[PDB]
């Protein structure tokens, strides 16, 4: 029998590693952190100066965040937990601040096609078909319909996935980028409520195995707690990282300051939390420390990435994606 | 020598995984959580609408719980820590509330045959031969005697086991279902007192390898803490889950509200605890948070299961039983 | 290269398991806990009714403990942190309480031969050559000298060891039992101070591989925290268990009651602690909860063992020594 | 696919062990701790009586520490976070206290060559080219330039490295010793900020595989918390250990006593901390317990090492470097 039980070796299909399971190995380097090139592909066509996108969540990204993110060289994805007219107006607001990149989330519900067309009319650059489970005909069909209808002017992202097969399906549907993350989010309770998930380093490695041969960038979404996690996600093969928790504490996120026991916080909640759905939960409502301006958070995050590129001899993100890991033990934390 | 010591490779026979060691992998799916079919076999003949049974414990299941459980589409197993006449009367009470399914525990002591016949007379549907260690001639003989005597009107469950061989023995004795769990219970101290046990995912996989080829359902009993654990136990191959801790906090369980430090609790104790035996302990007496009505707890539990069936593309429990896992590391919690 | 570094596969020689790493697997059984036979060989010649010996420590075993232990069916080993005359007088005191078995520790210092002869004269049954590191010519020579001089009337134990080779050396020197434990003691700081040790399940398996073929019993010494650990140590192949921590809280141990924050304690200290040596430390001075009479502690310990013998179908300790383990993961605790 | 994801087996290159992952196995021994020879090579030419060097940090080693360390039989490395004139004057101060060994850190910046020549003029014995990442042409060139210019009178150390290849590069550049440690320091945040590092036992094993064949000693730098860690680092093949945390609490380190909540502390900060750089941080500012005189700390540290040499039968450090480990599990701590 199989050492962990039963007679089927495929029952337990893999050993899933998360960020805390690995470290980047230093390598020969003539790259100074200050000189590394941090640009990377968000989608097949769109390159960002900084490989970071803010999550499509209503305690993270509305117009103010999208504007600050694009000015910092990344991009925001506007959340979709509001009327179609307001979302499109947020898109327009970002555009009124210059030639700034902006994305917007849509679902696959009755109302999604209308939403997508309104955002298109508003001048959106990227449409993110954004769902709990993208390995599904309705999601694949929406990705394909958008790519064939508005595809030559708008880039279309599909997510989220957690396996090589799911990512391959989005590639075949025409996705211009694939977003990876089922289970790892800081406010996510999918793992405890449904018992479902995939540790994020293994999920990225698997998705990249399906996406890289086709020139489709992977967006690592969820579970990033530290600047060093960004470096790890990219070295695992992702081209960008999507941040929720790390940006929800910033001045530019929606929400006000909360003072508890003399310290400053902001509210941060899952899109699957009770309160987000009353606008069986798979997300919580919580708080995160107030962090100040976005520009300052992004500076330290990018600083950590630059440090990693120095250590690994990576002049570009493309080079970082070829870096090697060491696996650590439980004693290692 | 063997890497862990000595010269015998069979000394340390396997690596045992528990619920926290695994996650369900998302898979291609056209199944909406709301549309999944949650029915499953309790025994060879009996199918439940909801794959959940309440434990035969005196702080969990008396008539009120059995009634609420059957109305929710599951079943209760009446505990046996009272006189034969009272247990049979509880059986009758459940039946007075309609054509509701109900089970009842018996042991293998002098008094067990009399108990079993009285419950039969009371109209019980399922008899559960329920013991700390079922891999034993007296237990096997009782299972067989019941199956040959009352077997065509009553289904007979045997438990508990933790190995492929033990489950195979119950199958050969005529069990209509096999119950798995030695060591994993929340109030169980078998692991620390006797040093005995089997991690529950590996125990289910092993028991299913013996039971499924013979069409005998496995009941996963003990160690379930979250709705996601129910999904994991079924995907490991079990057909139903038995709950103690998760239901002991409910309005319908025996026992009154306990107020400690401004919060509400109910008493929850092992059948092998001092107080359960004074009616060398292998169970504790504890408290669990008061949770309100059973209907509400079952709704969230079934909600979590439906979510898992959506993620895994499982239209039925039978399909869920073929789902795949990823193993996670210690960093994964 | 070797996956953990360097080019030498023998550098990291084995994966060491401790008690918490394993569980005993239930097996077919017709043995009732109440009926199991708990007797076992302390030495080649001496069998105990209960497979438990108290440590040769000055906060655990003086005459009162030795007397209580023998009456409970085990034995005490009198510590040697006092003058030769007092130790011998303690031996005599035990003998004045009937035909009770008693052992006594000696070292390998200048004074040890004199000590050994005085204890012999006092009527001691077992001499324990007791040292931090027995894999050493002076220890081997002392074991052999005693066996050739007083060996036909007194049994001679040697310890402590942690490897197959060390145990083999004591067997060749003539030891009648071998004591295993370098590093695992509750009050031991050898692991942090010297960086030396061996996880106790692997140490027992290795020592038994050297001792069992020669009919020499292994005494598992140190690291036992729960009654279930006793069962594990014996199933790993040991014939008896030596207890320090578990008995230091008892009425019969040396030392008085200590009241701290409304709860009762006794002092418990390593023989290598500062205070034991002032009569570079490798042991601490601590407290353990007061537990009451020895008889009560031994009853629960033996109760747990009986439970294990029931679960594993072990009618005798000899049978228990053939039981199988499952290895558990970090999530398993 | 590879069990942890993707199709490349080299992506995750190794399993990295840290000190807490291993223990030294006791071995046959005729070596008394008091009699072991603790001397070891700092560099190809320089042997120390005690295999310990103090870190080049401004809360650890200035003239007072360098003096105390050499008198204890080790050496100090003077930090370089001050003007060239003051560092050279510290070197001279040490020399005014007798024929004491002393080292000094230099970087690879514009000012480093001048620094190195001034320290040379001051009578320094060892120059340590000391950087976050030594696997780099500028570092290799500096090591080589120093070795060819002042190499016959001064020994030249290069660091830090974490891989076999990096250490091989320093050997080829002419290093007289190689210093190992990227990530493990107590005040280091490289792992969380950059996601970069190498567990220290595996890093030492790998570096030694490159250095030992060429007769170049390895200095184990960072992550040492206990005296037992020193023994482990040497048995892994290092010839000396560099200490920061363990010595920063001593009377001889720079800094004053800090009283917080009735207990005594000293400040201890990374050279990459904000405050060290304001003279994106990769080190913190913290406190360590005040420990008293250096002589006392070194005595217990050397005591622990002697204990390890006794247990492993190592008469010399060279013998200790051939000792074997056992790997432990997470339960092992
Ligand atoms: C609503 C609630 O919680 C959420 C909400 C949003 C996300 C989310 C992640 N991302 C990237 C974008 N949005 C995740 C969880 C929930 O339980 N959703 C849910 N659980 C299972 C399914 C399902 C699985 C198969 C199929 Br087919 C259809 C639905 N959906
Ligand atoms: C009474 C006490 O604690 C309990 C009580 C009930 C259960 C329990 C689980 N389940 C599913 C239904 N009931 C478990 C433990 C206890 O120690 N029992 C016990 N330990 C060993 C044996 C034994 C092992 C081999 C043989 Br053969 C006979 C008895 N029995
Ligand atoms: C005195 C201090 O602490 C102790 C004291 C007693 C025990 C102890 C266990 N047991 C079963 C019986 N007694 C263990 C540690 C200490 O450090 N002892 C020590 N550490 C290394 C050596 C050594 C190693 C090789 C050789 Br060869 C000679 C001595 N001795
Ligand atoms: C200044 C700050 O923090 C420090 C400061 C000193 C040390 C330190 C260790 N040791 C032994 C001696 N000094 C370590 C970290 C920092 O982030 N430094 C840094 N991170 C990446 C690079 C880099 C990587 C490739 C190349 Br090429 C050039 C620079 N440098
Ligand atoms: O309610 C939820 N349940 C599960 N995942 C969520 C939920 N809400 C947002 N997310 C995901 O979690 C990511 C943020 O993760 P974080 O950066 O670790 O906080 C988002 O970008 C989404 O992919
Ligand atoms: O005293 C005990 N010792 C060991 N297992 C028990 C005891 N009492 C009840 N159980 C088992 O534990 C299960 C409940 O586990 P739980 O749902 O994790 O709380 C029951 O259904 C029984 O199988
Ligand atoms: O000071 C010490 N250092 C290391 N081991 C000790 C020391 N003192 C007693 N012991 C060992 O530890 C055992 C007790 O371990 P315990 O039962 O876990 O508390 C004794 O029987 C000795 O083998
Ligand atoms: O700011 C820093 N970041 C990373 N490593 C540092 C820093 N400052 C000092 N070190 C390293 O950490 C070592 C001390 O580690 P410790 O002995 O564990 O405290 C030093 O000898 C340096 O190699």
UniProtKB/TrEMBL annotation, chains A, B, C, D:
Q: SMART domains this protein is in? A: CBS, IMPDH
| Organism, scientific name | Mycolicibacterium thermoresistibile (strain ATCC 19527 / DSM 44167 / CIP 105390 / JCM 6362 / NCTC 10409 / 316)
Name of the protein in question: Inosine-5'-monophosphate dehydrogenase
Pathway it belongs to?
A: Purine metabolism; XMP biosynthesis via de novo pathway; XMP from IMP: step 1/1
Q: Which residues bind K(+)?
A: 183, 185, 188
Kindly state which reaction or reactions the protein catalyses. Answer: IMP + NAD(+) + H2O = XMP + NADH + H(+)
Among its keywords, does the record have Oxidoreductase? yes
Q: What class of enzyme is it?
A: oxidoreductase
How does the annotation summarize its subunit structure? Homotetramer.
SUPFAM superfamilies given for it? CBS-domain pair, Inosine monophosphate dehydrogenase (IMPDH)
What keywords appear on the UniProt entry? CBS domain, GMP biosynthesis, Metal-binding, NAD, Oxidoreductase, Potassium, Purine biosynthesis, Repeat
Report the cofactors.
K(+)
- A GO biological process this protein is involved in? GTP biosynthetic process
Tell me its family: Belongs to the IMPDH/GMPR family.
Gene name of the record: guaB
Name the InterPro entries on file.
Aldolase_TIM, CBS_dom, CBS_dom_sf, IMP_DH, IMP_DH/GMP_Rdtase_CS, IMP_DH_GMPRt
Stored Gene3D superfamilies: Aldolase class I
Source taxon at top rank: Bacteria
- PROSITE patterns according to UniProt: CBS, IMP_DH_GMP_RED
Q: Name one GO molecular function term.
A: metal ion binding
Q: What does this protein do?
A: Catalyzes the conversion of inosine 5'-phosphate (IMP) to xanthosine 5'-phosphate (XMP), the first committed and rate-limiting step in the de novo synthesis of guanine nucleotides, and therefore plays an important role in the regulation of cell growth.
């Amino acid at each position: 029998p199989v050492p962990t039980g039963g007679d089927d070796p495929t029952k337990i299909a893999m050993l899933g590693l998360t960020f805390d399971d690995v470290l980047l190995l230093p390598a020969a380097s003539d790259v100074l952190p200050a000189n590394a090139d941090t640009s990377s592909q968000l989608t097949k066509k769109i390159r960002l100066k900084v490989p970071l996108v803010s999550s499509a969540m209503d305690t993270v990204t509305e117009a103010r965040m999208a504007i600050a993110m694009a000015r910092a060289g990344g991009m925001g994805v506007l959340h979709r937990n509001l009327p179609v007219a307001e979302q499109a107006a947020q898109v327009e607001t970002v555009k009124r601040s210059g030639g700034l990149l902006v994305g917007a989330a849509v679902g696959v519900g009755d109302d999604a096609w209308e939403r997508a067309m309104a955002l298109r009319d508003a001048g959106v650059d990227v449409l993110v078909v954004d769902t709990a489970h993208a390995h599904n005909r309705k999601v694949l069909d929406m990705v394909h319909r958008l790519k064939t209808t508005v595809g030559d002017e708008i880039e279309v992202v599909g997510g989220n996935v957690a396996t090589r097969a799911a990512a391959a399906a989005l590639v075949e549907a025409g996705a211009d980028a694939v977003k990876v993350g089922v289970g790892p989010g800081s406010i996510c309770t999918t793992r405890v409520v449904a018992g479902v998930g995939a540790p994020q380093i293994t999920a990225i490695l698997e998705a990249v195995a399906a996406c890289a041969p086709h020139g489709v960038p992977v967006i690592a979404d969820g579970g990033l707690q530290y600047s060093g996690d960004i470096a790890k996600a990219l070295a695992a093969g992702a081209s960008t990282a999507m941040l929720g928790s790390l940006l929800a504490g910033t001045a530019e996120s929606p929400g006000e300051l909360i003072l508890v026991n003399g310290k400053q916080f902001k509210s941060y909640r899952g899109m699957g939390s009770l309160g987000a759905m009353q606008g069986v939960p798979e997300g919580i409502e919580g708080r995160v420390p107030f962090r100040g301006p976005l520009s300052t958070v992004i500076h330290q995050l990018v600083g950590g990435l630059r440090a990693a590129m120095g250590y690994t001899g990576s002049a570009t993100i493309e080079e970082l994606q070829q870096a090697q890991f060491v696996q650590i033990t439980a004693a290692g934390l």
